[PDB]
Design a binder for this molecule. Structure first.
Ligand code: POV
Ligand code: POV
Ligand code: POV
Ligand code: POV
Ligand code: POV
Ligand code: POV
Ligand SMILES: *[C@@H]1O[C@H](CO)[C@@H](O[C@@H]2O[C@H](CO)[C@@H](O)[C@H](O)[C@H]2NC(C)=O)[C@H](O)[C@H]1NC(C)=O
Ligand code: CLR
Ligand code: CLR
Ligand code: CLR
Ligand code: 2J9
Ligand code: GLU
Ligand code: GLU
Lengths: 192, 48, 202, 96
């Protein structure tokens, strides 16, 4: 629309002709290639050799400058926020992701409730985990919680355990967190 | 009682405060509406 | 925060556990609430949950109630949410009289349902409602059209205002040169032959 | 890169000469010393007196302006955090 006006405005047709203007000279510097160069040149805050004459093209240059004043000013405002790195999302996020992979070994404390949970489970996702855990039972089923915590640190291993004991570990080691929501709900009760 | 079938907790129920949107003339907000006139009366003044 | 103010009235269902909780509480914060609630007991202690929910909507009122019933309401009304964490922890239990052969049989029967996940399947059947369009999820706030918006409006209105100056520049020229050269309406169309030329010229 | 393209593009060859050349005074004003000055002059947000004319040099002018638009904007947005020096916060504040 700058090129349409500059080929319609009867004042943009100026003569370069510096000495003494005779006749038969005048020509627009706004070719259609040039009008992108004013549009890109004003948008990139650097300014062009082009500068309009002829008030109808000044208003296009006036409103496009106030357009690109706000867009550059708004872009620099949020740019302090978005220059923060995000750490990698874990390849597991729930029981469905952790069951459908063989890269990360996973088990629980043997002779515990979690081993007993998947052993007598009939959920199709959770039966896949006990189908996994029963095969390499010597390797992935550790003997205690402390051996389960240590093999997460010293290897590539996701460990199935209680929620409240995670609440003590993750407040102690800040490199190691809870993945996903609670599978079931249980309770510590004083046995009699 | 039997042994529970659902876990509870006392909590507070209250209305959400309305998130009034920054309407599409939001970029005029960082200056007062008389300062936008005072800049406009400057560039109409200093140019004169 | 809710104890240290008098702007927002607050109560609970009368003859319930929450009223019983603050009545026999010895926490210094929670005793302040029952010191509040016992005075204007007729006003802030509603008779049911449904009267408690409605007075949050129809007035300035924060309501003390169970967590799981909030989980059904906030999935139904998206203008009204849970404030803060859980005060205590309790449980819905199937009540039996003082000494019954049905206490231990249900205790077996409840534990059978949760390892089969059926207590979780029944809770998702009822507490899942409209889905409730959730939250802005407070993070960095990349600018959409809804909050820049008007700089395209003044750009569109600026180009509309520009082209009437362009015909204003056209007619003021077409009235000026036609004083001596040509006539009024035709010399406008003469310059239309100039402008529609695809080349450079005089 | 701009000096390579300016000598290679046959449209940056113009004659300065605003008055009736009649044979040949065609020049190619981008030297080495002018090509760095367009690069430095756009890097410091000031802008030179020299502007590309052929489209073969406009994209070089176009991308380099967009490059310096992001460098300077990322410089200003980050430096607000580094002048506002977050003070000494030795991690003991109370008995807790
Ligand atoms: C993101 C990308 C999207 C696409 C980009 C946008 C589209 C691309 C735009 C393509 C065309 C625009 C490029 C500049 C002009 C081309 C010049 C040229 O090729 O060499 C010519 C030198 O002769 C001239 O230079 C004559 C100058 C013409 C006026 C310049 C603007 C009018 C173009 C109006 C453009 C359409 C507007 C509506 C019509 C008014 C050689 O002459 P020619 O080859 O033999 O041509 C016939 C000769 N004639 C013209 C002299 C009679
Ligand atoms: C540095 C440059 C300075 C230039 C000097 C000129 C400055 C003269 C300006 C003077 C005052 C203009 C702004 C008014 C003050 C804003 C406060 C307000 O209450 O308005 C509000 C009403 O919305 C409006 O009515 C805004 C005015 C509409 C016209 C905007 C023209 C843009 C300026 C043309 C310059 C381009 C050309 C420039 C030259 C080529 C806007 O806020 P809101 O978002 O609606 O909030 C409610 C939303 N809600 C209802 C959902 C909750
Ligand atoms: C030499 C010295 C000068 C001599 C003295 C001369 C006398 C001058 C004395 C002036 C005295 C001041 C009187 C006005 C006060 C307004 C403030 C206000 O509160 O109202 C509103 C201003 O919001 C607007 O609507 C502004 C109008 C549109 C903005 C575009 C104007 C400039 C356009 C581009 C300029 C191109 C620049 C070209 C440069 C070459 C804000 O509140 P609101 O909520 O938005 O109200 C809505 C009102 N409405 C419903 C009707 C919409
Ligand atoms: C070439 C292409 C043309 C095609 C496109 C044309 C299309 C444009 C049509 C029409 C554009 C012109 C009228 C504006 C109405 C737009 C409609 C609108 O959105 O409502 C507006 C009301 O109205 C206003 O608030 C605008 C106030 C004046 C600003 C516009 C002129 C600038 C004044 C200075 C002169 C500058 C020039 C001189 C500078 C030197 C915005 O209020 P809203 O309703 O709440 O917004 C809805 C958003 N919502 C749904 C989220 C709630
Ligand atoms: C242009 C000619 C072709 C060149 C092609 C070869 C050049 C390459 C040379 C070096 C790079 C080699 C390394 C990367 C190779 C692949 C590229 C890549 O990264 O893909 C990117 C897309 O790529 C794009 O879409 C960006 C292209 C920008 C186009 C600019 C046009 C400007 C013209 C306008 C000028 C206006 C002028 C104004 C005046 C009028 C994204 O991929 P990714 O995010 O990195 O993937 C990560 C995946 N991961 C997340 C799993 C880890
Ligand atoms: C201030 C005014 C300046 C105007 C310039 C505007 C230029 C065009 C603007 C935007 C065009 C593309 C917008 C999509 C970018 C989103 C991020 C993204 O996808 O990155 C992804 C890969 O990277 C990509 O896939 C993008 C590939 C193209 C990059 C180069 C574009 C700049 C053109 C060069 C020319 C320079 C200028 C030409 C003139 C000289 C990274 O993965 P992700 O982030 O995890 O995925 C999220 C994807 N999502 C957000 C879409 C959901
Ligand atoms: C969100 O909550 C209400 C809903 O609009 C707003 O406050 C009430 O608004 C109605 C009209 O919609 C008035 O009749 C009431 O008198 C208002 N009450 C109060 C206490 O203000 C409230 O302003 C909205 N916005 C925010 C930010 O809370
Ligand atoms: C060059 C001209 C056209 C610019 C616009 C007019 C100027 C001279 C006028 C318009 C409104 C005026 C301001 C109105 C209010 C105050 C607050 C007062 O406590 C100190 C003076 C001060 C800050 C004035 C300074 C001068 C001022 C900015
Ligand atoms: C200015 C011209 C040349 C190019 C841009 C086109 C303009 C007119 C169009 C393109 C995208 C459009 C916006 C797209 C989405 C919305 C959100 C809606 O809730 C209100 C209208 C609004 C805000 C539109 C307003 C007009 C708009 C800004
Ligand atoms: C909407 C209209 C009526 C109001 C604006 C009037 C416009 C179209 C006209 C009226 C008089 C015109 C001016 C008359 C004389 C000259 C001197 C010349 O060397 C450059 C153009 C210039 C500066 C004109 C620019 C456009 C102009 C200002
Ligand atoms: O294993 S239980 O004794 N009975 C089953 N349930 C729940 C249904 C959630 C709960 C919930 C919380 C507990 F502390 C104990 C139990
Ligand atoms: N704490 C569990 C054992 C460990 C586990 O299963 O995670 C139990 O009481 O049986
Ligand atoms: N649900 C509670 C009553 C309501 C309340 O105290 O909040 C109970 O079982 O006693």
């Amino acid at each position: 629309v700058l090129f349409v006006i500059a080929r319609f405005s009867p004042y943009e047709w100026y003569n370069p002709h510096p000495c003494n203007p005779d006749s038969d000279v005048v020509e627009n510097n706004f070719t259609l290639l040039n009008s992108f160069w004013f549009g890109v040149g004003a948008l990139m805050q650097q300014g062009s050799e082009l500068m309009p004459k002829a008030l109808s093209t000044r208003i296009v240059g006036g409103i496009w400058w106030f357009f690109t004043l706000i867009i550059i000013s708004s872009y620099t405002a949020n740019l302090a926020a978005f220059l923060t790195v995000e750490r990698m999302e874990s390849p597991i996020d729930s029981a469905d992701d952790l069951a459908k992979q063989t890269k990360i070994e996973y088990g629980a404390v043997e002779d515990g409730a979690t081993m007993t949970f998947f052993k007598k489970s009939k959920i199709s996702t959770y039966d896949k985990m006990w189908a996994f855990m029963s095969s390499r039972r010597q390797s992935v089923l550790v003997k205690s919680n402390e051996e389960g915590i240590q093999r997460v640190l010293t290897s590539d291993y996701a460990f199935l355990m209680e929620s409240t004991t995670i609440e003590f570990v993750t407040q102690r080691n800040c490199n190691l967190t809870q993945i996903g929501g609670l599978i079931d709900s249980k309770g510590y009760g004083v046995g009699t | 009682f039997s042994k529970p079938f659902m876990t509870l907790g006392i909590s507070i129920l209250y209305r959400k405060p309305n998130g009034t949107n920054p309407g599409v003339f939001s970029f005029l907000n960082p200056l007062s509406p008389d300062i936008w006139m005072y800049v406009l009366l400057a560039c109409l003044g200093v140019s004169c | 925060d809710l104890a240290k103010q008098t702007k927002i009235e607050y109560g609970a269902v009368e003859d319930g556990a929450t009223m019983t909780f603050f009545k026999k509480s010895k926490i210094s914060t929670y005793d302040k609430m029952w010191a509040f609630m016992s005075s204007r007991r007729q006003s802030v202690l509603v008779k049911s949950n449904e009267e408690g929910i409605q007075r949050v909507l129809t007035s300035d009122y924060a309501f003390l109630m169970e967590s799981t019933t909030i989980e059904f309401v906030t999935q139904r009304n998206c203008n009204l949410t849970q404030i803060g964490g859980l005060i205590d922890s309790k449980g819905y239990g199937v009540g039996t009289p003082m000494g019954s052969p049905y206490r231990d049989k249900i205790t077996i029967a409840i534990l059978q349902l949760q390892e089969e996940g059926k207590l979780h399947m029944m809770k998702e059947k009822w507490w899942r409602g409209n889905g409730c369009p959730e939250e802005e999820s407070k993070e960095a706030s990349a600018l959409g059209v809804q909050n820049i918006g008007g700089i395209f409006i003044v750009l569109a209105a600026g180009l509309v205002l520009s082209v009437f100056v362009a015909v204003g520049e056209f007619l003021y020229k077409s009235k000026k040169n036609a004083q001596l050269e040509k006539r009024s309406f035709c010399s406008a169309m003469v310059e239309e032959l100039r402008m529609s030329l695809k080349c450079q010229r005089r």
